[PDB]
Amino acid sequence: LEDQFIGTRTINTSASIIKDFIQSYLGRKFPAEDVQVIVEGNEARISMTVYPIRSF
C-alpha cells in the first residue's frame, strides 16, 4: 500500500500529525500501536510492523 503527498501543500506538519493522518486514512479505509514515524530533514519514514507465520 502507498499513499503519499508532495508539493508544499501543507504547513507546520509534525510526526504526530503524520501518524494521525495515516490512521485517518486507515480508519476510513491496522493498529495505531503497530506503526512508527521518524521525521528527519525532508523525509518521513513510516514503518509498519508485520507478523510472519511461525511454524509450531
Binding site: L1, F5, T13, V50
Partner: protein
Amino acid sequence: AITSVDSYLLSEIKPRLNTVLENCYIIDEVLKDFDYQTRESFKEAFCGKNAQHEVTVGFNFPKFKNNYEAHYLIQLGQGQETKNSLGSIQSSYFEATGDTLVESSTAIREDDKLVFTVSKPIGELIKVEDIEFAKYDNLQVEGNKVSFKYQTNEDYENYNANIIFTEKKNDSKGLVKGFTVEEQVTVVGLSFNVDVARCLDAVLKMILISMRDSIEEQQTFQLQNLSFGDIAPIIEDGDSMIFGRPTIIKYTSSLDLDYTITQDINKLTFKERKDWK
C-alpha cells in the same frame, strides 16, 4: 506588520491638506455652512496658489517655535489589544508577501502577447482594472510582468489600466503571528484666531472622511472612529491666547510578525519490518 499610526497620519494628512488648500472651490464647498465673512477671510488668507499664509503639520514637543497662526499638532495616544486569534495565528502564507500597491500601466504587444509591466515582482495580483479575463485569454503572471493573449485583443494593443497587486519578499513558508490593537491619536488645529480654529476643524473632518477610502486604512487601520473636544484656550498667558479644538481618531489594526518555517517535507517513504516475536 508593526505599525505607527502617528507617522501614517502625518504622511497622509500633509499631501491631502496641501492639495485641498491649492484648490479654491473645494474650500468654498467645505465651508458653505459658515458665515460669509469667515469663509471669505479664510479663503483669502490660506487658500489658492497665491496664499500668503500657510498651514503646517507636525508632532508635539518640537524644540522650535511653530506657526501658531494655523498648525495641526499630531499627538500619539493610548491603545489596547482587543481581539486575539487561536494560537495567535493571524494568517498563513506560502510566499512572503509585502505591501499592497496600485500602479498605472499600459499594455504593449510582445511576441503576440499583450503584457503589462509593473515596477516590482508581483507576489499576488488582486485586480487588473476594468478587465475580467476568460480562460481563453490565457492570463499568466511571471516575475514583475502580467501577460495576456494578443490574438482576439488586438484593439487593446495600447490599453491603459491600473494594476492592484502586492509585492513578494521571498519564496518561504510561515505563520503571521500577532493580534489586533485599538489605538488613539489626537489631532488639534491650533490658531490664535478662533474662526481659524473652527475652519481648521471643518477641513480636518473633511480630510478624514476622504481618508476613509484610501487603501492604507482599507487594508490596515480599519474602523476609523472620531471624537471631538471643546474649543478652549491651549495657552492663556501670552500677549494673546492660543485656541484649539481637539479631535481623537481611533483605529483598529493588526500587530504581527512573519514567523518563517524552515521545516519542509517533500517525500513520505514506507517500509515494512517483520516481527518474529
